[PDB]
């Protein structure tokens, strides 16, 4: 119920896989710390967070869905946590894939309409969606995602 | 014009404070950004300080070992960088520079890049008087 | 990324051509920015990503940086345009950019 569980679970089935070593989540949990990314959409939904670490072996996107909001760390300088309902993680290797991501990221988020049926929908629904629209773009070539990278989250 | 002007240097005393500014004209001063580097005698383009746009929230941030001692801020209304230095030391006394960087790094904006700094002024010296 | 290396200087003949770099763990990705800095003045900007120049920048600093290591490839020294000169990594590693390398030039 806290983010850095959500992030230690979320990475998890992903490290699984070998996708990024040294466990990576600690990492995660402090860069987001140290520089959050903007969070509010402009509906119920929340932006992407994202490590841009060194020892990722290739790209992957990492969903999941939570049942209640967590009050993820805010972004602008104000006292404005933002609710989120669903978490996001992605993996990446040096800064043009994680500013490609991002900007595919930026187009998904202002899909009002998805979002809610993120909220709602089940997991292979979550997966076939997500998976379909990464396969869309004509950018976005080799980011893995799996079937085990959507899971329910605490 | 174009070309920035740093002021408020002088002869400090350890463990004194100062402001330190940079003045900016001719140009829209939140198009571009400013953060701070230092340039001791033998060295060069130190990093002192970086905080982010109001675009970007405003985030603030400091150079490795000079937390808290380095306040950054700015007056977007006067189009100018400033820095509140405190518990000085006498190997910190250098050449400060207002660095002009052309990004951004958020969401619902765009403009990902380098700092990729371009043209910025002579900088103000900051010694101990004794 | 993290310390970047460099020698205290480089005597460059006119035609020597030569190869002064920045170093790090790895530059043939995650690239630096340089600058060129007037005896007495501020450092200001000598070349752009990867290899790219500002109006005004001669055929000199066209360097490729097809390997690991960043070089800058000066052609020689023309006139009085001998100046300092030091480069800018973002490293990511740490989220904010560290500055280093860069020579001193010295001819005849």
């Known amino acids: 119920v806290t983010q850095e569980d959500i992030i230690r679970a979320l990475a998890s089935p992903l490290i699984k896989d070998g996708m990024v070593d040294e466990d990576f989540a600690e990492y995660v949990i402090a860069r987001e710390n140290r520089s959050p990314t903007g969070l509010q959409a402009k509906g119920v939904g929340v932006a992407i967070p994202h490590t841009l670490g060194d020892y990722v072996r290739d790209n992957a996107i990492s969903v999941g869905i939570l049942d209640k909001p967590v009050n993820f760390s805010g972004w602008y300088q104000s006292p404005d946590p933002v609710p989120v309902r669903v978490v996001f993680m992605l993996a990446g290797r040096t800064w043009d894939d994680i500013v490609i991501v991002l900007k595919w990221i930026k187009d998904v988020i202002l899909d009002e309409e998805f979002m809610k049926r993120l909220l709602n929908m089940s997991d292979e629904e979550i997966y076939r969606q997500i998976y379909t629209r990464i396969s869309k773009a004509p950018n976005l070539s080799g980011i893995n995602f799996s079937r085990e990278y959507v899971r329910h989250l605490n | 014009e174009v070309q920035l002007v740093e002021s408020g240097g002088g002869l400090v005393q350890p463990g004194g404070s100062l402001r330190l500014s940079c003045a900016a004209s001719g140009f829209t001063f939140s198009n571009y950004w400013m953060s701070w580097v230092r340039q001791a005698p033998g060295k060069g383009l130190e990093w002192v300080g970086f905080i982010k746009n109001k675009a970007d929230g405003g985030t603030a941030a400091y150079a490795e070992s000079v937390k808290g001692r380095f306040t950054i801020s700015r007056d977007d209304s006067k189009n100018t960088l400033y820095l509140q230095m405190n518990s000085l030391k006498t190997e910190d006394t250098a050449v400060y520079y207002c660095?002009?960087?052309?990004?951004?790094?958020?969401?619902?904006?765009?403009?990902?890049?380098?700092?990729?700094?371009?043209?910025w002024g002579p900088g103000v010296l900051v010694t101990v008087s004794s | 990324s993290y310390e970047v290396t460099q020698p205290p200087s480089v005597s460059v003949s006119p035609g020597q051509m030569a190869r002064i770099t920045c170093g790090g763990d790895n530059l043939g990705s995650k690239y630096v920015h340089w600058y060129q800095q007037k005896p007495a003045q501020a450092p200001v900007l000598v070349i752009y990503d990867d290899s790219e120049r500002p109006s005004g920048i001669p055929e000199r600093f066209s360097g490729s940086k097809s390997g690991n290591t960043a070089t800058l490839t000066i052609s020689g020294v023309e006139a009085g345009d001998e100046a300092d000169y030091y480069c800018q990594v973002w490293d990511s590693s740490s989220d904010h950019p560290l500055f280093g390398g860069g020579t001193r030039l010295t001819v005849l």
């Open positions: 660095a002009r960087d052309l990004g951004r790094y958020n969401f619902w904006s765009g403009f990902y890049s380098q700092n990729r700094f371009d043209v």
